[PDB]
Paper text:
During this exercise, 229 FABP crystal structures from various human and mouse isoforms were determined, many at better than 1.2 Å resolution.
Fatty acid-binding proteins (FABPs) are involved in the uptake, metabolism and intracellular trafficking of fatty acids. Based on epidemiological studies and animal knockout models, the isoforms FABP4 and FABP5 were identified as potential diabetes and atherosclerosis targets.
Author numbering: 1 to 132
Amino acid sequence: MCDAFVGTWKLVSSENFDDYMKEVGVGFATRKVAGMAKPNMIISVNGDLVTIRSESTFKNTEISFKLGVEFDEITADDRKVKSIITLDGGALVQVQKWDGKSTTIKRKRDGDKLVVECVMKGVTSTRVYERA
């Protein structure tokens, strides 16, 4: 399950992430620190349970979830959201909802890369990772 995604992934490019975080409502100071962080993303699977960690000097976070089962999450920027993650077309698609708002984070394998596209109200950021 989700075999392709398993690994340790290091950030290699980031496009439009500051504007994405502005749209989400992340504060100035936090955007500054989060933008200069170069997180590793560590994805593992155990039976039907998927775990994603994001590790950086900014913060360490971890979510554990089942596909297609809504779960509560505190994000790196301290939002309390309801999240649902699904496998569609080989991409892992995460929707976060809070306070009448919504954002989508898509993680797709493209060659030897993991491409992460984050969208909120038509503002899109793209972050590309490769295996560490």
